[PDB]
Amino acid sequence: MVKVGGEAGPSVTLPCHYSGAVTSMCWNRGSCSLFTCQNGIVWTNGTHVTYRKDTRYKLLGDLSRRDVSLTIENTAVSDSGVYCCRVEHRGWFNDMKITVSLEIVPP
Ligand code: NA
Numbered sequence: 001m002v003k004v005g006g007e008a009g010p011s012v013t014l015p016c017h018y019s020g021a022v023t024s025m026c027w028n029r030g031s032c033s034l035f036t037c038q039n040g041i042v043w044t045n046g047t048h049v050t051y052r053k054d055t056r057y058k059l060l061g062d063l064s065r066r067d068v069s070l071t072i073e074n075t076a077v078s079d080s081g082v083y084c085c086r087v088e089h090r091g092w093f094n095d096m097k098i099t100v101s102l103e104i105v106p107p
Helices: none
Strands: 002-007 012-014 025-029 040-044 049-052 070-072 081-087 096-105
Touching (some): 002 012
Antiparallel strands (some): 025 081, 040 049
């Protein structure tokens, strides 16, 4: 599990990188599970973000180099929780899933 966090306010980045050919991914707000981002907050098509639930959610890394790290701007305590970085592959069982814990503490 990846552990990140900080005091509420400043941005935090949830690191996520994958291997192989460029492919689509989504971020889940919640633990990783069987199905693709059931509480999805960001979706990509491999090269671009196609949808985000909140404008605070940004992918500021180089997607073409498989850096799909999520930055949350203007963090709040309520952002705390488990997130899933899910990189989509062609099987049923072979998606790459990284679990990230986010801890945003009160100032
Ligand atoms: Na991968």
